[PDB]
Amino acid sequence: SCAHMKQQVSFTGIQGDSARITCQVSNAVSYWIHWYRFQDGKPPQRLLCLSRESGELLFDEGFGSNKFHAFKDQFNGEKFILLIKKLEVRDSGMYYCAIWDWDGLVKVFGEGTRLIVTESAFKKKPPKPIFFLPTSEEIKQKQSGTYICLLEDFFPNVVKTYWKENSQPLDAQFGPITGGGNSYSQVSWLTVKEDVLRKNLTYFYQHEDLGMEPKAFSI
Amino acid sequence: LLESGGKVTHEGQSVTLTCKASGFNFKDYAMSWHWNPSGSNRQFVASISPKTGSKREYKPSIQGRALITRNNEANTVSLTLRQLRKEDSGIYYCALAEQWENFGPGTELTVLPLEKTLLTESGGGTYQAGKTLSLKCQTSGFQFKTSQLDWYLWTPGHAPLWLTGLNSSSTDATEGRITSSREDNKNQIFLQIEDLGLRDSGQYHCARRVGNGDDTDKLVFGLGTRVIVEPRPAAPLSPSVFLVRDQDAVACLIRNFYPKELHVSLTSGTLISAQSLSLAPTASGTYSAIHIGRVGENDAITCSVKHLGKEIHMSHQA
Numbered sequence: 001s002c003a004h005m006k007q008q009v010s011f012t013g014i015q016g017d018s019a020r021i022t023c024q025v026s027n028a029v030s031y032w033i034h035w036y037r038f039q040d041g042k043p044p045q046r047l048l049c050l051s052r053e054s055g056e057l058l059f060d061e062g063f064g065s066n067k068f069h070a071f072k073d074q075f076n077g078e079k080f081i082l083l084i085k086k087l088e089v090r091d092s093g094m095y096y097c098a099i100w101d102w103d104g105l106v107k108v109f110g111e112g113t114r115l116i117v118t119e120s121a122f123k124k125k126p127p128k129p130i131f132f133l134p135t136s137e138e139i140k141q142k143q144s145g146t147y148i149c150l151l152e153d154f155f156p157n158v159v160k161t162y163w164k165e166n167s168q169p170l171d172a173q174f175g176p177i178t179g180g181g182n183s184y185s186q187v188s189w190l191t192v193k194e195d196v197l198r199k200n201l202t203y204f205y206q207h208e209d210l211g212m213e214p215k216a217f218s219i
Numbered sequence: 220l221l222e223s224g225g226k227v228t229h230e231g232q233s234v235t236l237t238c239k240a241s242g243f244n245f246k247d248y249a250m251s252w253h254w255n256p257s258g259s260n261r262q263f264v265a266s267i268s269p270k271t272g273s274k275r276e277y278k279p280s281i282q283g284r285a286l287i288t289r290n291n292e293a294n295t296v297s298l299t300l301r302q303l304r305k306e307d308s309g310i311y312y313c314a315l316a317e318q319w320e321n322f323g324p325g326t327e328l329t330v331l332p333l334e335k336t337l338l339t340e341s342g343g344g345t346y347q348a349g350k351t352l353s354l355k356c357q358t359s360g361f362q363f364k365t366s367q368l369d370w371y372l373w374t375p376g377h378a379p380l381w382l383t384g385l386n387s388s389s390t391d392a393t394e395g396r397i398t399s400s401r402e403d404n405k406n407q408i409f410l411q412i413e414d415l416g417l418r419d420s421g422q423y424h425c426a427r428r429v430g431n432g433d434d435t436d437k438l439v440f441g442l443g444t445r446v447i448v449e450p451r452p453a454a455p456l457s458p459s460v461f462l463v464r465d466q467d468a469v470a471c472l473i474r475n476f477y478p479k480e481l482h483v484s485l486t487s488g489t490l491i492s493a494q495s496l497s498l499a500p501t502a503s504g505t506y507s508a509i510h511i512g513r514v515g516e517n518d519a520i521t522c523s524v525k526h527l528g529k530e531i532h533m534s535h536q537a
Protein backbone atom coordinates (compact mmCIF):
# COMPACT_ATOMS: atom_id res chain seq x y z
CA SER A 1 0.00 0.00 0.00
CA CYS A 2 2.53 2.57 -1.21
CA ALA A 3 2.08 6.15 -2.37
CA HIS A 4 1.77 6.84 -6.10
CA MET A 5 1.79 10.04 -8.17
CA LYS A 6 -0.07 10.24 -11.48
CA GLN A 7 1.19 13.00 -13.79
CA GLN A 8 0.25 13.83 -17.36
CA VAL A 9 2.83 12.52 -19.79
CA SER A 10 3.83 16.05 -20.86
CA PHE A 11 2.63 19.64 -21.08
CA THR A 12 3.37 21.93 -24.02
CA GLY A 13 2.30 25.55 -24.16
CA ILE A 14 2.98 28.51 -26.41
CA GLN A 15 5.77 30.69 -25.05
CA GLY A 16 4.45 33.38 -22.72
CA ASP A 17 1.40 31.40 -21.54
CA SER A 18 0.83 29.38 -18.36
CA ALA A 19 1.54 25.70 -17.69
CA ARG A 20 -0.65 23.59 -15.38
CA ILE A 21 1.35 20.48 -14.50
CA THR A 22 -1.10 18.25 -12.65
CA CYS A 23 -0.29 15.58 -10.07
CA GLN A 24 -2.83 13.20 -8.53
CA VAL A 25 -1.70 11.66 -5.24
CA SER A 26 -2.56 8.14 -4.06
CA ASN A 27 -2.13 6.90 -0.47
CA ALA A 28 -0.27 9.92 0.91
CA VAL A 29 -0.58 11.47 4.39
CA SER A 30 2.54 13.68 4.37
CA TYR A 31 0.77 17.12 4.27
CA TRP A 32 3.60 18.42 2.03
CA ILE A 33 3.90 18.02 -1.75
CA HIS A 34 7.25 19.08 -3.21
CA TRP A 35 7.97 20.06 -6.80
CA TYR A 36 11.31 19.12 -8.35
CA ARG A 37 12.75 20.12 -11.70
CA PHE A 38 15.30 18.21 -13.74
CA GLN A 39 16.91 20.28 -16.48
CA ASP A 40 19.18 18.37 -18.86
CA GLY A 41 22.72 19.26 -17.78
CA LYS A 42 21.83 20.74 -14.37
CA PRO A 43 21.49 18.74 -11.15
CA PRO A 44 17.84 18.24 -10.16
CA GLN A 45 16.58 20.81 -7.66
CA ARG A 46 13.35 21.41 -5.77
CA LEU A 47 11.49 24.47 -6.99
CA LEU A 48 9.11 24.70 -4.03
CA CYS A 49 6.84 22.81 -1.65
CA LEU A 50 3.14 23.21 -0.85
CA SER A 51 1.17 22.28 2.25
CA ARG A 52 -1.84 20.06 1.60
CA GLU A 53 -3.52 21.48 4.71
CA SER A 54 -2.75 25.21 4.86
CA GLY A 55 -1.80 26.06 1.27
CA GLU A 56 1.39 27.92 2.15
CA LEU A 57 4.28 27.62 -0.29
CA LEU A 58 8.00 27.55 0.45
CA PHE A 59 10.18 28.38 -2.53
CA ASP A 60 13.80 27.36 -2.93
CA GLU A 61 16.86 29.40 -3.79
CA GLY A 62 16.04 31.73 -6.68
CA PHE A 63 12.45 30.59 -7.27
CA GLY A 64 9.36 32.63 -6.53
CA SER A 65 5.66 33.26 -7.00
CA ASN A 66 6.19 35.27 -10.21
CA LYS A 67 7.06 32.09 -12.13
CA PHE A 68 5.68 29.25 -9.98
CA HIS A 69 2.53 28.67 -7.96
CA ALA A 70 1.37 25.42 -6.36
CA PHE A 71 -2.20 24.75 -5.29
CA LYS A 72 -4.78 22.00 -4.89
CA ASP A 73 -7.44 21.65 -7.57
CA GLN A 74 -10.91 22.09 -6.12
CA PHE A 75 -12.16 19.90 -8.97
CA ASN A 76 -11.90 16.08 -8.87
CA GLY A 77 -10.33 16.21 -5.39
CA GLU A 78 -6.73 15.53 -4.27
CA LYS A 79 -5.46 16.93 -7.58
CA PHE A 80 -2.54 19.32 -7.23
CA ILE A 81 -1.25 21.81 -9.79
CA LEU A 82 2.10 23.43 -10.36
CA LEU A 83 1.39 26.53 -12.45
CA ILE A 84 4.47 27.78 -14.30
CA LYS A 85 3.63 31.30 -15.48
CA LYS A 86 5.22 33.27 -18.34
CA LEU A 87 6.92 30.31 -19.99
CA GLU A 88 10.41 30.54 -21.49
CA VAL A 89 12.73 27.97 -23.05
CA ARG A 90 14.98 27.83 -19.97
CA ASP A 91 11.78 26.69 -18.22
CA SER A 92 11.76 23.53 -20.37
CA GLY A 93 12.62 20.28 -18.65
CA MET A 94 11.15 17.67 -16.31
CA TYR A 95 8.68 18.61 -13.57
CA TYR A 96 8.06 16.01 -10.84
CA CYS A 97 5.82 16.03 -7.79
CA ALA A 98 7.29 14.32 -4.73
CA ILE A 99 6.37 13.36 -1.18
CA TRP A 100 7.84 11.70 1.89
CA ASP A 101 6.69 8.15 2.63
CA TRP A 102 7.50 5.17 4.86
CA ASP A 103 7.95 7.16 8.08
CA GLY A 104 9.68 9.98 6.21
CA LEU A 105 12.86 8.11 5.24
CA VAL A 106 12.15 7.69 1.50
CA LYS A 107 10.97 10.28 -1.04
CA VAL A 108 8.56 9.21 -3.78
CA PHE A 109 8.42 11.02 -7.13
CA GLY A 110 5.90 11.04 -9.93
CA GLU A 111 6.69 9.63 -13.36
CA GLY A 112 7.36 13.20 -14.48
CA THR A 113 5.78 15.74 -16.80
CA ARG A 114 8.03 17.12 -19.52
CA LEU A 115 7.48 20.82 -20.11
CA ILE A 116 8.32 21.77 -23.70
CA VAL A 117 8.19 25.44 -24.67
CA THR A 118 7.56 26.07 -28.35
CA GLU A 119 8.97 29.29 -29.77
CA SER A 120 5.59 29.84 -31.49
CA ALA A 121 2.19 28.19 -31.89
CA PHE A 122 2.18 24.42 -32.38
CA LYS A 123 -0.04 21.65 -33.73
CA LYS A 124 -0.89 19.16 -30.96
CA LYS A 125 -1.47 16.12 -33.18
CA PRO A 126 -2.26 12.76 -31.53
CA PRO A 127 -0.65 9.38 -32.28
CA LYS A 128 -2.07 6.89 -34.75
CA PRO A 129 -1.38 3.19 -34.07
CA ILE A 130 -1.02 0.40 -36.60
CA PHE A 131 -0.80 -3.21 -35.42
CA PHE A 132 0.86 -6.19 -37.10
CA LEU A 133 -0.20 -9.58 -35.75
CA PRO A 134 2.21 -12.53 -35.60
CA THR A 135 2.36 -14.48 -38.84
CA SER A 136 1.94 -18.20 -39.39
CA GLU A 137 5.53 -18.30 -40.65
CA GLU A 138 6.80 -16.68 -37.44
CA ILE A 139 4.86 -19.08 -35.21
CA LYS A 140 6.01 -22.04 -37.31
CA GLN A 141 9.65 -20.91 -37.34
CA LYS A 142 10.09 -19.52 -33.81
CA GLN A 143 7.26 -21.13 -31.75
CA SER A 144 6.28 -17.62 -30.64
CA GLY A 145 4.55 -14.57 -32.04
CA THR A 146 5.42 -10.89 -32.21
CA TYR A 147 2.84 -8.12 -31.96
CA ILE A 148 4.29 -5.04 -33.64
CA CYS A 149 2.70 -1.67 -32.89
CA LEU A 150 3.82 1.44 -34.76
CA LEU A 151 2.62 4.70 -33.22
CA GLU A 152 3.03 7.26 -35.99
CA ASP A 153 2.56 10.98 -36.53
CA PHE A 154 2.21 12.51 -33.08
CA PHE A 155 3.23 15.76 -31.41
CA PRO A 156 4.97 16.36 -29.09
CA ASN A 157 7.85 13.85 -29.09
CA VAL A 158 6.62 12.26 -25.85
CA VAL A 159 4.49 9.12 -25.38
CA LYS A 160 4.14 6.24 -22.91
CA THR A 161 3.16 2.73 -24.02
CA TYR A 162 2.77 -0.69 -22.40
CA TRP A 163 1.02 -4.05 -22.70
CA LYS A 164 -1.12 -5.92 -20.17
CA GLU A 165 -3.18 -9.07 -20.71
CA ASN A 166 -2.24 -9.71 -15.79
CA SER A 167 -2.02 -6.39 -13.96
CA GLN A 168 1.75 -5.90 -14.18
CA PRO A 169 2.57 -4.62 -17.69
CA LEU A 170 4.23 -7.08 -20.04
CA ASP A 171 7.89 -6.78 -20.96
CA ALA A 172 8.19 -5.42 -24.51
CA GLN A 173 10.93 -3.92 -26.65
CA PHE A 174 10.63 -0.22 -27.45
CA GLY A 175 12.23 1.56 -30.38
CA PRO A 176 13.95 4.94 -30.40
CA ILE A 177 11.47 7.75 -30.95
CA THR A 178 12.33 8.94 -34.47
CA GLY A 179 11.13 12.02 -36.30
CA GLY A 180 11.41 15.77 -36.48
CA GLY A 181 9.60 19.01 -37.07
CA ASN A 182 5.97 18.36 -36.19
CA SER A 183 5.90 14.57 -36.63
CA TYR A 184 7.47 11.89 -34.42
CA SER A 185 6.94 8.14 -34.14
CA GLN A 186 7.83 5.06 -32.08
CA VAL A 187 7.56 1.30 -32.65
CA SER A 188 7.08 -1.25 -29.85
CA TRP A 189 6.99 -5.03 -30.28
CA LEU A 190 5.92 -7.74 -27.82
CA THR A 191 7.11 -11.32 -28.43
CA VAL A 192 4.56 -13.59 -26.73
CA LYS A 193 4.95 -17.36 -26.50
CA GLU A 194 2.77 -19.76 -28.49
CA ASP A 195 0.78 -20.52 -25.32
CA VAL A 196 -0.40 -17.03 -24.30
CA LEU A 197 -1.22 -16.32 -27.95
CA ARG A 198 -4.88 -17.20 -27.38
CA LYS A 199 -5.21 -14.92 -24.35
CA ASN A 200 -6.96 -11.61 -25.00
CA LEU A 201 -4.24 -9.14 -24.12
CA THR A 202 -4.70 -5.38 -24.11
CA TYR A 203 -2.38 -2.67 -25.40
CA PHE A 204 -2.37 0.62 -23.47
CA TYR A 205 -0.87 3.95 -24.49
CA GLN A 206 -0.85 7.52 -23.15
CA HIS A 207 -0.16 10.83 -24.91
CA GLU A 208 -0.77 14.46 -23.97
CA ASP A 209 -3.69 14.85 -26.39
CA LEU A 210 -5.67 12.00 -24.77
CA GLY A 211 -5.50 13.68 -21.36
CA MET A 212 -4.75 11.59 -18.28
CA GLU A 213 -6.63 8.35 -18.94
CA PRO A 214 -4.94 5.86 -21.29
CA LYS A 215 -6.27 4.41 -24.52
CA ALA A 216 -6.67 0.66 -24.98
CA PHE A 217 -6.78 -1.86 -27.82
CA SER A 218 -8.00 -5.41 -27.30
CA ILE A 219 -6.78 -8.62 -28.97
CA LEU B 220 10.95 40.14 31.66
CA LEU B 221 10.84 36.61 30.22
CA GLU B 222 11.95 36.13 26.62
CA SER B 223 11.86 33.08 24.37
CA GLY B 224 13.59 32.07 21.17
CA GLY B 225 17.35 31.84 20.81
CA LYS B 226 17.42 28.53 18.94
CA VAL B 227 20.41 27.16 17.00
CA THR B 228 20.40 28.00 13.29
CA HIS B 229 22.82 28.72 10.47
CA GLU B 230 24.09 32.08 9.24
CA GLY B 231 21.56 32.43 6.39
CA GLN B 232 18.32 31.88 8.25
CA SER B 233 16.17 34.36 10.17
CA VAL B 234 15.04 34.11 13.79
CA THR B 235 12.27 35.70 15.86
CA LEU B 236 12.97 36.38 19.53
CA THR B 237 9.97 37.21 21.71
CA CYS B 238 9.75 38.77 25.18
CA LYS B 239 6.78 38.78 27.58
CA ALA B 240 6.28 41.16 30.50
CA SER B 241 3.78 41.33 33.35
CA GLY B 242 3.36 43.40 36.51
CA PHE B 243 3.51 47.00 35.24
CA ASN B 244 2.14 49.31 32.56
CA PHE B 245 3.50 47.46 29.54
CA LYS B 246 1.49 49.60 27.13
CA ASP B 247 3.00 52.84 28.44
CA TYR B 248 6.74 52.16 28.84
CA ALA B 249 9.39 52.02 26.14
CA MET B 250 11.09 48.71 25.37
CA SER B 251 14.51 47.80 24.01
CA TRP B 252 16.60 44.81 23.03
CA HIS B 253 20.30 44.78 23.89
CA TRP B 254 23.10 42.42 22.91
CA ASN B 255 26.29 41.19 24.58
CA PRO B 256 28.55 39.02 22.40
CA SER B 257 28.99 36.04 24.74
CA GLY B 258 28.46 38.52 27.59
CA SER B 259 30.15 41.61 29.06
CA ASN B 260 29.36 43.85 26.05
CA ARG B 261 25.69 44.75 26.55
CA GLN B 262 25.01 47.28 23.79
CA PHE B 263 21.69 48.85 22.87
CA VAL B 264 20.72 47.18 19.59
CA ALA B 265 17.01 47.93 19.25
CA SER B 266 14.65 50.49 20.75
CA ILE B 267 10.89 50.90 20.29
CA SER B 268 8.24 52.93 22.06
CA PRO B 269 5.50 50.30 22.69
CA LYS B 270 2.93 53.10 22.46
CA THR B 271 3.59 52.37 18.81
CA GLY B 272 6.68 52.20 16.64
CA SER B 273 7.04 55.97 16.51
CA LYS B 274 10.65 55.93 17.72
CA ARG B 275 12.32 52.68 16.61
CA GLU B 276 16.11 53.03 16.56
CA TYR B 277 17.62 49.60 15.88
CA LYS B 278 20.64 50.49 13.87
CA PRO B 279 23.95 49.98 15.77
CA SER B 280 25.30 46.97 13.87
CA ILE B 281 22.15 45.06 12.80
CA GLN B 282 20.49 47.87 10.86
CA GLY B 283 18.28 46.57 8.10
CA ARG B 284 17.74 43.12 9.65
CA ALA B 285 16.25 43.97 13.07
CA LEU B 286 12.51 44.42 13.58
CA ILE B 287 11.16 44.94 17.10
CA THR B 288 7.38 44.90 17.41
CA ARG B 289 5.22 45.28 20.52
CA ASN B 290 1.71 43.84 20.62
CA ASN B 291 0.75 44.33 24.31
CA GLU B 292 -2.26 42.02 23.84
CA ALA B 293 -0.14 38.98 24.68
CA ASN B 294 2.46 41.38 26.14
CA THR B 295 4.91 40.41 23.40
CA VAL B 296 7.96 42.35 22.23
CA SER B 297 9.69 40.63 19.33
CA LEU B 298 13.06 41.23 17.71
CA THR B 299 13.14 39.50 14.34
CA LEU B 300 16.69 39.12 13.00
CA ARG B 301 16.31 38.38 9.32
CA GLN B 302 19.87 37.76 8.06
CA LEU B 303 21.98 36.46 10.93
CA ARG B 304 25.77 36.25 10.77
CA LYS B 305 28.66 34.57 12.58
CA GLU B 306 29.06 37.46 15.02
CA ASP B 307 25.35 37.60 15.88
CA SER B 308 26.15 34.85 18.41
CA GLY B 309 25.53 36.22 21.87
CA ILE B 310 23.13 36.99 24.68
CA TYR B 311 20.22 39.20 23.63
CA TYR B 312 18.71 41.01 26.61
CA CYS B 313 15.24 42.50 27.05
CA ALA B 314 14.82 45.88 28.75
CA LEU B 315 17.66 61.47 22.18
CA ALA B 316 18.57 58.03 23.56
CA GLU B 317 16.18 57.15 26.39
CA GLN B 318 17.96 55.66 29.42
CA TRP B 319 17.41 51.90 29.90
CA GLU B 320 18.99 50.26 32.98
CA ASN B 321 16.31 47.71 34.06
CA PHE B 322 17.73 44.76 32.11
CA GLY B 323 16.31 41.23 32.11
CA PRO B 324 17.62 37.62 31.64
CA GLY B 325 18.73 37.58 27.98
CA THR B 326 18.38 34.50 25.76
CA GLU B 327 21.33 33.18 23.77
CA LEU B 328 21.46 32.99 19.97
CA THR B 329 24.05 30.61 18.48
CA VAL B 330 24.64 30.90 14.73
CA LEU B 331 26.54 28.29 12.73
CA PRO B 332 28.74 28.59 9.61
CA LEU B 333 27.20 28.25 6.15
CA GLU B 334 26.68 24.81 4.63
CA LYS B 335 27.10 24.40 0.88
CA THR B 336 26.25 20.93 -0.41
CA LEU B 337 28.75 19.77 -3.05
CA LEU B 338 27.86 16.25 -4.21
CA THR B 339 30.04 14.83 -7.01
CA GLU B 340 29.16 11.39 -8.37
CA SER B 341 31.63 9.33 -10.38
CA GLY B 342 32.09 5.81 -11.71
CA GLY B 343 29.47 5.43 -14.45
CA GLY B 344 29.72 4.30 -18.05
CA THR B 345 28.61 1.21 -19.96
CA TYR B 346 28.57 -2.22 -18.35
CA GLN B 347 27.60 -5.80 -19.10
CA ALA B 348 24.91 -7.65 -17.15
CA GLY B 349 26.13 -9.65 -14.17
CA LYS B 350 29.14 -7.38 -13.66
CA THR B 351 29.40 -5.58 -10.33
CA LEU B 352 29.11 -1.78 -10.43
CA SER B 353 30.72 0.46 -7.80
CA LEU B 354 29.80 4.16 -7.71
CA LYS B 355 31.51 6.93 -5.71
CA CYS B 356 30.08 10.18 -4.35
CA GLN B 357 32.38 12.90 -3.02
CA THR B 358 30.63 14.99 -0.35
CA SER B 359 32.00 18.40 0.62
CA GLY B 360 30.65 21.36 2.57
CA PHE B 361 28.80 19.84 5.53
CA GLN B 362 29.28 17.71 8.63
CA PHE B 363 29.41 14.23 7.11
CA LYS B 364 28.85 11.82 9.98
CA THR B 365 25.47 13.29 11.01
CA SER B 366 24.04 13.79 7.51
CA GLN B 367 21.39 11.68 5.74
CA LEU B 368 22.62 10.40 2.39
CA ASP B 369 20.70 8.46 -0.25
CA TRP B 370 21.13 7.16 -3.79
CA TYR B 371 18.42 7.73 -6.39
CA LEU B 372 17.85 6.33 -9.89
CA TRP B 373 16.59 8.71 -12.59
CA THR B 374 15.42 6.75 -15.62
CA PRO B 375 13.84 8.63 -18.54
CA GLY B 376 10.11 8.04 -18.72
CA HIS B 377 10.33 6.47 -15.24
CA ALA B 378 9.72 8.02 -11.85
CA PRO B 379 12.97 8.69 -9.96
CA LEU B 380 13.51 5.95 -7.42
CA TRP B 381 15.30 5.62 -4.08
CA LEU B 382 17.95 2.89 -3.98
CA THR B 383 19.73 2.89 -0.59
CA GLY B 384 20.60 5.40 2.11
CA LEU B 385 22.03 5.97 5.57
CA ASN B 386 21.45 7.97 8.78
CA SER B 387 23.70 9.17 11.60
CA SER B 388 22.93 6.17 13.83
CA SER B 389 22.61 3.99 10.75
CA THR B 390 24.92 1.05 11.58
CA ASP B 391 22.96 -0.91 8.96
CA ALA B 392 25.05 -1.89 5.90
CA THR B 393 22.13 -3.30 3.94
CA GLU B 394 22.77 -6.51 2.00
CA GLY B 395 21.33 -7.31 -1.40
CA ARG B 396 21.75 -6.20 -5.01
CA ILE B 397 21.63 -2.66 -3.56
CA THR B 398 24.65 -1.86 -1.35
CA SER B 399 25.55 1.46 0.29
CA SER B 400 28.71 2.10 2.29
CA ARG B 401 30.41 5.22 3.58
CA GLU B 402 34.02 6.15 4.22
CA ASP B 403 34.04 8.68 7.05
CA ASN B 404 37.74 9.54 6.69
CA LYS B 405 37.55 10.41 2.98
CA ASN B 406 34.05 11.92 3.40
CA GLN B 407 32.77 9.63 0.64
CA ILE B 408 29.75 7.42 0.00
CA PHE B 409 29.50 4.38 -2.27
CA LEU B 410 26.89 2.40 -4.18
CA GLN B 411 27.24 -1.19 -5.38
CA ILE B 412 24.98 -3.06 -7.81
CA GLU B 413 26.00 -6.67 -8.33
CA ASP B 414 24.51 -8.68 -11.21
CA LEU B 415 23.40 -5.59 -13.12
CA GLY B 416 19.95 -6.00 -14.60
CA LEU B 417 18.53 -4.19 -17.60
CA ARG B 418 16.04 -2.03 -15.68
CA ASP B 419 19.15 -0.98 -13.72
CA SER B 420 20.06 1.63 -16.37
CA GLY B 421 19.80 5.39 -15.97
CA GLN B 422 21.43 8.29 -14.16
CA TYR B 423 22.49 7.58 -10.57
CA HIS B 424 22.22 10.54 -8.20
CA CYS B 425 23.81 11.17 -4.83
CA ALA B 426 21.38 13.01 -2.58
CA ARG B 427 21.50 14.85 0.74
CA ARG B 428 18.45 15.64 2.85
CA VAL B 429 18.40 19.24 4.10
CA GLY B 430 15.91 21.33 6.02
CA ASN B 431 14.29 21.72 9.43
CA GLY B 432 14.27 17.95 9.93
CA ASP B 433 10.60 17.42 9.01
CA ASP B 434 8.40 16.85 5.94
CA THR B 435 9.48 20.38 4.89
CA ASP B 436 12.97 19.05 4.04
CA LYS B 437 14.26 18.75 0.47
CA LEU B 438 16.86 16.73 -1.44
CA VAL B 439 20.01 18.36 -2.77
CA PHE B 440 21.08 16.27 -5.76
CA GLY B 441 24.47 15.97 -7.39
CA LEU B 442 25.11 16.14 -11.11
CA GLY B 443 24.80 12.36 -11.16
CA THR B 444 26.66 9.79 -13.22
CA ARG B 445 25.08 7.79 -16.00
CA VAL B 446 24.97 3.99 -16.31
CA ILE B 447 24.11 1.92 -19.38
CA VAL B 448 23.61 -1.86 -19.28
CA GLU B 449 24.21 -3.91 -22.44
CA PRO B 450 23.68 -7.63 -23.00
CA ARG B 451 26.02 -10.23 -21.57
CA PRO B 452 28.42 -10.91 -24.49
CA ALA B 453 27.22 -14.15 -26.07
CA ALA B 454 28.33 -16.19 -29.04
CA PRO B 455 27.17 -14.93 -32.46
CA LEU B 456 23.54 -15.71 -33.27
CA SER B 457 22.02 -15.05 -36.59
CA PRO B 458 18.69 -13.28 -36.94
CA SER B 459 15.31 -14.73 -37.90
CA VAL B 460 13.79 -12.46 -40.55
CA PHE B 461 10.06 -12.13 -41.19
CA LEU B 462 7.93 -9.67 -43.15
CA VAL B 463 4.51 -8.44 -41.99
CA ARG B 464 2.59 -6.19 -44.39
CA ASP B 465 -0.60 -4.36 -43.45
CA GLN B 466 -2.55 -2.03 -45.78
CA ASP B 467 0.26 -0.13 -47.52
CA ALA B 468 2.65 -0.44 -44.55
CA VAL B 469 5.29 -3.17 -44.24
CA ALA B 470 7.53 -4.14 -41.34
CA CYS B 471 10.63 -6.35 -41.28
CA LEU B 472 10.94 -8.21 -37.97
CA ILE B 473 14.50 -9.31 -37.16
CA ARG B 474 15.41 -11.16 -33.99
CA ASN B 475 18.01 -12.97 -31.88
CA PHE B 476 21.29 -11.53 -33.14
CA TYR B 477 24.39 -10.63 -31.14
CA PRO B 478 26.21 -8.55 -32.24
CA LYS B 479 23.75 -6.00 -33.64
CA GLU B 480 25.95 -4.20 -36.17
CA LEU B 481 23.66 -5.33 -39.01
CA HIS B 482 22.53 -2.98 -41.79
CA VAL B 483 18.86 -3.76 -42.41
CA SER B 484 17.27 -2.19 -45.49
CA LEU B 485 13.88 -2.51 -47.16
CA THR B 486 13.97 -2.65 -50.97
CA SER B 487 12.04 -5.07 -55.92
CA GLY B 488 15.47 -3.45 -56.10
CA THR B 489 13.85 -0.06 -55.40
CA LEU B 490 15.05 1.54 -52.17
CA ILE B 491 12.22 2.74 -49.94
CA SER B 492 12.26 6.41 -48.95
CA ALA B 493 10.22 5.87 -45.76
CA GLN B 494 12.00 3.23 -43.68
CA SER B 495 13.48 3.27 -40.18
CA LEU B 496 15.32 0.71 -38.06
CA SER B 497 14.65 0.24 -34.34
CA LEU B 498 17.15 -1.93 -32.47
CA ALA B 499 16.44 -3.22 -28.96
CA PRO B 500 17.79 -6.13 -26.90
CA THR B 501 15.42 -8.83 -25.67
CA ALA B 502 15.24 -10.74 -22.37
CA SER B 503 17.49 -13.47 -23.84
CA GLY B 504 20.82 -11.64 -24.17
CA THR B 505 20.59 -10.87 -27.90
CA TYR B 506 19.21 -7.97 -29.90
CA SER B 507 16.05 -7.85 -31.98
CA ALA B 508 15.12 -5.14 -34.45
CA ILE B 509 12.31 -3.88 -36.66
CA HIS B 510 12.81 -1.99 -39.92
CA ILE B 511 9.51 -0.44 -40.94
CA GLY B 512 8.29 1.30 -44.09
CA ARG B 513 5.38 1.77 -46.49
CA VAL B 514 4.47 -0.13 -49.67
CA GLY B 515 0.97 -0.32 -51.10
CA GLU B 516 -1.53 -3.16 -50.86
CA ASN B 517 -0.68 -4.11 -54.46
CA ASP B 518 3.09 -3.51 -54.54
CA ALA B 519 5.54 -6.28 -53.62
CA ILE B 520 8.48 -5.83 -51.27
CA THR B 521 11.83 -7.25 -50.14
CA CYS B 522 13.81 -6.98 -46.90
CA SER B 523 17.59 -7.41 -46.63
CA VAL B 524 19.45 -8.04 -43.36
CA LYS B 525 23.27 -8.11 -43.41
CA HIS B 526 24.04 -9.41 -39.94
CA LEU B 527 27.77 -10.14 -40.08
CA GLY B 528 28.74 -13.55 -41.47
CA LYS B 529 25.43 -14.02 -43.31
CA GLU B 530 22.81 -12.04 -45.24
CA ILE B 531 19.11 -12.93 -45.14
CA HIS B 532 16.39 -11.63 -47.45
CA MET B 533 12.65 -12.13 -47.38
CA SER B 534 10.36 -11.02 -50.20
CA HIS B 535 6.58 -10.93 -50.48
CA GLN B 536 4.76 -10.91 -53.81
CA ALA B 537 1.78 -9.07 -55.28
Ligand SMILES: *[C@@H]1O[C@H](CO)[C@@H](O)[C@H](O)[C@H]1NC(C)=O
Binds near residue numbers: 103386389
Ligand atom coordinates in the same frame (compact mmCIF):
# COMPACT_ATOMS: atom_id res chain seq x y z
C1 LIG C 1 17.48 6.74 10.85
O1 LIG C 1 16.21 6.08 10.59
C2 LIG C 1 15.41 5.72 11.72
C3 LIG C 1 14.19 5.00 11.18
O2 LIG C 1 13.31 4.61 12.23
C4 LIG C 1 15.06 6.99 12.48
O3 LIG C 1 14.23 6.67 13.59
C5 LIG C 1 16.35 7.65 12.95
O4 LIG C 1 16.03 8.84 13.66
C6 LIG C 1 17.26 7.98 11.76
N1 LIG C 1 18.53 8.50 12.24
C7 LIG C 1 18.67 9.69 12.82
C8 LIG C 1 20.05 10.05 13.27
O5 LIG C 1 17.72 10.46 12.98
